[PDB]
Structure formats: structure tokens, C-alpha cells
Amino acid sequence: MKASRLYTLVLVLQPQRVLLGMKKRGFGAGRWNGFGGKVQEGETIEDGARRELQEESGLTVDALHKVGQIVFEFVGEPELMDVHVFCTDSIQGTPVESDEMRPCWFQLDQIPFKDMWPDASYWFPLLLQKKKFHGYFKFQGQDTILDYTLREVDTV
Ligand code: NA
């Protein structure tokens, strides 16, 4: 069996648009994603998600709602990524670009799937329908899915 490391992913989903962030630097730059990163010792998963949202997008929110969980496995990496996915309840500030991340709004008929992680084409439609989900994706490198599962659930 494998070990897993905890990560968060936050989607700022409004009725007609979604905020995504483009990774600006380093390996893996050039794709759009939600905001997030590793959970730190002691903080709850939700508080880690709020923290990463503020660091990467500038937005400060009091509460999130958990919508999904996605496990990622990469060929050659024994550690799994256990990603807890949240959506914002409400926002009340503007997103800010950093040297690491550029936030941008997309209309919900212009979701930039071809420039997102390949897995997002599978679970993001569920998120848009306000459904909850569990997913698993095995990748060869950054682009190729070798195996995956996706299931709508009633409780995350
Ligand atoms: Na991050």
C-alpha cells in the first residue's frame, strides 16, 4: 500500500463564472487550476484550503463547502496526492496576481478545459452541476491518464 499527502483545491464558482489560476513559474507552469496546496500540520483541511486561497488568489473567505475528493497517482512516484476539493460560499474582495499565480475569471460556457489538468474534464462538470464526487486518476507524466475512476457521492 501507499502513503498519501494532503492537498486542497478551491474553486471560486459564481452563478455565471469561475475563477481559475494559471501557474506562472517552474515545472508545471501554463495550466489553469483551482487554488490550493499542501495542508500544514495542525490546521484543518478546510482552514488549509482557506489559507491557500488567500495566498494564491488574494481572496479571504470565512467558509468553504467541501464538494469532492480526488486521489492522484503518478507513475514513478510512490506517494499519492489526496486532494480535498472545496467551493467558496461567497467572496468579498478582488483576486490579485502574484509572481507565482495569475487568477482569471472564465464564463461558464468558456471553461478552458484544454488548458486545465486532464482530470478536470471529468470532475469539473459534476462540480458545475453542484454534485459531490470522489475521483482517482493515475497519470504517466503530466498529460496522460492510464486509469481513473469517478463516482458521484451523496457525502464527501
Ligand atoms: Na499551490
Numbering used by the authors: 1 to 156
Show passages lifted from the paper.
In the nucleotide pool, which is more susceptible to oxidation by reactive oxygen species than DNA, human MutT homolog 1 (hMTH1, human NUDT1) is the most prominent mammalian enzyme among other enzymes responsible for sanitization of the nucleotide pool. hMTH1 is characterized by broad substrate specificity as compared with Escherichia coli MutT; that is, hMTH1 hydrolyzes different oxidized nucleotides such as 8-oxo-dGTP, 2-oxo-dATP, and 8-oxo-dATP with almost the same efficiency, whereas MutT shows high substrate specificity for 8-oxoguanine nucleotides. Accordingly, hMTH1 prevents mutations and cell dysfunction by its hydrolytic activity toward both 2-oxo-dATP and 8-oxo-dGTP.
In terms of the 8-oxo-dGTPase activity, D120N and D120A showed only 4 and 8% of the activity of the wild type, respectively, because of their high Km and low kcat values. The face of 8-oxoG and the direction of deoxyribose are completely turned over in comparison with those in the wild type complex: this phenomenon is the result of the loss of two hydrogen bonds between Asp-120 and 8-oxoG. In the case of D120A, because the hydrogen bond between Asn-120 and O6 of 8-oxoG observed in the D120N complex is lost, O6 of 8-oxoG is recognized via a hydrogen bond with Asn-33 and a water-mediated hydrogen bond with Asp-119 instead. The 3′-OH group of deoxyribose in both complexes is directed away from Thr-8 and Gly-34, which are involved in the recognition of 3′-OH in the wild type. The electron densities of 8-oxo-dGTP in both mutants are ambiguous as compared with those in the wild type. This result indicates lower occupancy and/or loose binding of 8-oxo-dGTP. The structural arrangement of the triphosphate reflects the lower kcat values in both mutants.
